[PDB]
Amino acid sequence: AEPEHDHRKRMGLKMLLMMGLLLPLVYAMKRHKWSVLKSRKLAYRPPK
Amino acid sequence: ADLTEYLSRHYKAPRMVLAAAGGLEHRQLLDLAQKHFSGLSGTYDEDAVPTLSPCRFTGSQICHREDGLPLAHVAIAVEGPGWAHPDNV
């Protein structure tokens, strides 16, 4: 029914291990850029 | 008291320079310096005299948004080296 069975599970382990690297890495990349906004401080200074 | 404390700590002879330029001999500049400045640090060389310490440059932004003003001012700088550095030229 499914001769690909063993190949798909091999690529799956590669997929899971790669994603275990790339998901925290791209997360850090996105957080690094969003740093400037996420830690920003506002002050309101109207006259008189 | 704040003001005289500042004066006491900072206006001390090894930290100040009598400069002149023009129609003068150096000799009389020296003469007048002993005449009028010599009661400054003859025995006043005392207390924590007074180390500066390096200033941490950041890399950051301050944005005072005021749309009521007709022109934008922007100043941008990287950290330069001090007075001493040959890189200045």
Swiss-Prot record, chain A:
Transmembrane segments: 5-38
Coiled-coil blocks: none
Domain of life: Eukaryota
Annotated compartments: Mitochondrion inner membrane
Mitochondrial matrix side: 39-48
Family the UniProt entry places it in: Belongs to the cytochrome c family.
Subunit structure: Component of the ubiquinol-cytochrome c oxidoreductase (cytochrome b-c1 complex, complex III, CIII), a multisubunit enzyme composed of 11 subunits. The complex is composed of 3 respiratory subunits cytochrome b, cytochrome c1 and Rieske protein UQCRFS1, 2 core protein subunits UQCRC1/QCR1 and UQCRC2/QCR2, and 6 low-molecular weight protein subunits UQCRH/QCR6, UQCRB/QCR7, UQCRQ/QCR8, UQCR10/QCR9, UQCR11/QCR10 and subunit 9, the cleavage product of Rieske protein UQCRFS1.
Function: Component of the ubiquinol-cytochrome c oxidoreductase, a multisubunit transmembrane complex that is part of the mitochondrial electron transport chain which drives oxidative phosphorylation.
Annotated protein name in UniProt: Cytochrome c1, heme protein, mitochondrial
UniProtKB/Swiss-Prot annotation, chain B:
Similarity annotation: Belongs to the peptidase M16 family. UQCRC1/QCR1 subfamily.
Job description of the protein: Component of the ubiquinol-cytochrome c oxidoreductase, a multisubunit transmembrane complex that is part of the mitochondrial electron transport chain which drives oxidative phosphorylation.
Lineage: Eukaryota, Metazoa, Chordata, Craniata, Vertebrata
Subunit structure: Component of the ubiquinol-cytochrome c oxidoreductase (cytochrome b-c1 complex, complex III, CIII), a multisubunit enzyme composed of 11 subunits. The complex is composed of 3 respiratory subunits cytochrome b, cytochrome c1 and Rieske protein UQCRFS1, 2 core protein subunits UQCRC1/QCR1 and UQCRC2/QCR2, and 6 low-molecular weight protein subunits UQCRH/QCR6, UQCRB/QCR7, UQCRQ/QCR8, UQCR10/QCR9, UQCR11/QCR10 and subunit 9, the cleavage product of Rieske protein UQCRFS1.
Disulfide-bonded cysteines: none
Designated name of the protein: Cytochrome b-c1 complex subunit 1, mitochondrial
Localization in the cell: Mitochondrion inner membrane
Protein source organism: Bos taurus (Bovine)
Residues modified as N6-acetyllysine: 35
